[PDB]
């Protein structure tokens, strides 16, 4: 069944750039049952953990993070690219292959003491997630754990995210 989800993920050569094989998640999303199952297995992988909020980075993160928040009866916080959030924000820099970029969170998104599960579609290098984790901590939040639908085990995302509990459903 997870095997079946895995086989439904479309691999696209050289997107966004040559050397990357992109994991296209849209066929999972458009299939009612596959989408439902994906959310259910994410919830299931979080059993036994204590948390108050889900946070996800824009934009593919939202697609699993927001329904999973709904499914778990918790709140949802978007972590966003610069310029998108209207109110006062905090910003955090992360590494790209040959540069840096930033992500932002609203200053009021997480309260001190709140336990947060960070969700995303895929763990690659882990830069966007690292920045998200640090944004949550800057507000007094604690990162309970980090969950992904898929993980690229050749890219050392786990190493970048040292000290965090990392869960992924499908490991490539």
Residues serving a catalytic function are: 60, 97
Q: Which residues pair with 100 in a beta bridge?
A: 95
C-beta closer to a second copy: residue 52 or 95: 52
C-beta closer to a second copy: residue 79 or 161: 79
- Give the tokens for residue 129: 């997630």
Q: Which helix (H) or strand (E) holds 34?
A: helix 32-45
Out of Cl ion, a second copy, none, what residue 36 binds, judged by CB under 5 to 8 A for its kind, is a second copy
d(CA 87, CA 107): 8
- Sign for the pseudo-dihedral over CA of 156, 160, 162, 164: negative
Out of Cl ion, a second copy, none, what residue 167 binds, judged by CB under 5 to 8 A for its kind, is Cl ion
Q: What is the closest distance, in whole angstroms, from the C-beta atom of residue 73 to Cl ion in the complex?
A: 23
Does 49 sit near a second copy (CB under 8 A)? no
Does 58 sit near a second copy (CB under 8 A)? yes
The residue within the footprint of a second copy, chosen from 6, 27, 137, 138 (CB under 8 A), is 27
Contact 77, 54 (CB under 8 A): yes
User: Residue 145 phi/psi, 5° resolution?
Assistant: -165, 170
* Overall size of the chain counted in residues: 172
Q: Which helix (H) or strand (E) holds 144?
A: strand 142-151
Per-residue contact track with a second copy, 64 to 83, x per CB under 8 A?
Answer: x-xx-xxx-xxxxxx-x--x
Q: What is the closest distance, in whole angstroms, from the C-beta atom of residue 167 to Cl ion in the complex?
A: 4
β-pair type (75-79, 53-57): parallel
C-beta closer to a second copy: residue 70 or 93: 70
The residue within the footprint of Cl ion, chosen from 39, 142, 167, 170 (CB under 5 A), is 167
Does 170 sit near Cl ion (CB under 5 A)? no
Does 108 sit near a second copy (CB under 8 A)? yes
d(CA 147, CA 12): 23
Binding site for Cl ion (CB under 5 A): 167
């Amino acid at each position: 069944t997870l095997e079946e989800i895995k086989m439904m993920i479309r691999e696209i050569p050289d997107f966004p750039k040559k050397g990357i094989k992109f994991k296209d998640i849209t066929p999972v999303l458009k299939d009612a049952k596959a989408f439902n199952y994906s959310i259910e297995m994410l919830a299931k992988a979080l059993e036994g953990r204590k948390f108050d909020l889900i946070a996800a980075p824009e934009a593919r993160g939202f697609l699993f993070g927001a329904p999973l928040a709904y499914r778990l009866g918790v709140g949802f916080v978007p972590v966003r690219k610069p310029g998108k959030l209207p109110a006062e924000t905090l910003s955090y820099e992360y590494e790209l292959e040959y540069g840096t970029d930033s992500l932002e969170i609203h200053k009021d998104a997480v309260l001190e003491g709140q336990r947060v599960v960070i969700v995303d579609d895929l763990l690659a290098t882990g830069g966007t997630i690292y920045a998200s984790a640090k944004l949550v901590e800057s507000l007094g939040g604690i990162v309970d754990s980090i969950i992904f639908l898929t993980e690229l085990t050749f890219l050392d995302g786990r190493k970048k995210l040292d000290g965090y509990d990392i869960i992924s459903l499908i490991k490539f």
